[PDB]
Amino acid sequence: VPISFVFNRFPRMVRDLAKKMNKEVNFIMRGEDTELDRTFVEEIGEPLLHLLRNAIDHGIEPKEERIAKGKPPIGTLILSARHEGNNVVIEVEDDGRGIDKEKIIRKAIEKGLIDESKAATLSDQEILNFLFVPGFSTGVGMDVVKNVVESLNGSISIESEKDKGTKVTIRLPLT
């Protein structure tokens, strides 16, 4: 199917979540005509909704806070799909507050998953990969998202920078 069968539900959900969280959001969808196997289309909606909720709740800052930090007042959330080879790549990008990598490390230390000595040389991808540890952040856990994607033989990655925003990328096979 076109992925629009899933993506067409999102403007309403984003607008309802934005209203609930009293938060202003500029929501853009691109690549909605990207086609993929019906199995994927039936299963990818749930993980994507979790990602979009997380971006609206934890990422995008209130307008007053963005203005105070010198950002464009209204936060932007971009959901896109495209073909890459025989795979389909779906991205959810926000220009919010980003993920605090220092906080991740502190939490990882507190949970006994690493010591201070080793945290000093971790890469960015290594740090962000703690988010996929079951119960790490415990509120949509990145573990739960990843478990669905993996059930579709897909892969997920996260990139993020404090004050800049977050991009989550999902790659799915043709199957």
Q: Which residues bind ligand WUT (CB under 6 A)?
A: 54-55, 58-59, 94, 96-99, 166
- Considering CB distances under 5 to 8 angstroms, the limit depending on partner class, which of a copy of itself, ligand WUT, none binds residue 76? none
Nearer to ligand WUT, 88 or 95 (CB): 95
- Considering CB distances under 5 to 8 angstroms, the limit depending on partner class, which of a copy of itself, ligand WUT, none binds residue 120? a copy of itself
Measure Cα distances from 140 to 44, 50, 98, 146 in Å: 15, 6, 16, 11
The residue sitting closest to ligand WUT, measured at its beta carbon, is 59
Rounded to the nearest 5°, which phi and psi values hold at 160?
Answer: -160, 150
Residue 54 · residue 94 · CB < 8 Å: no
| Nearest CA-CA partner of 70 in 103, 102, 95, 100 | 95
Instruction: Please tell me the distance from the alpha carbon of residue 105 to that of residue 175, in angstroms, as a whole number.
Output: 37
Nearer to ligand WUT, 17 or 173 (CB): 17
- Considering CB distances under 5 to 8 angstroms, the limit depending on partner class, which of ligand WUT, a copy of itself, none binds residue 126? a copy of itself
* Minimum distance of a copy of itself from residue 119's CB (angstroms): 9
Nearer to ligand WUT, 79 or 89 (CB): 79
Binding residues for a copy of itself, rule: CB under 8 A, are 86-87, 117-118, 120-123, 125-126, 150, 153-155, 157, 171-174
52 exposure class (CB count in 10 Å sphere: 0-12, 13-18, 19+) = buried
Q: How far apart are the first and last CA of the chain?
A: 13
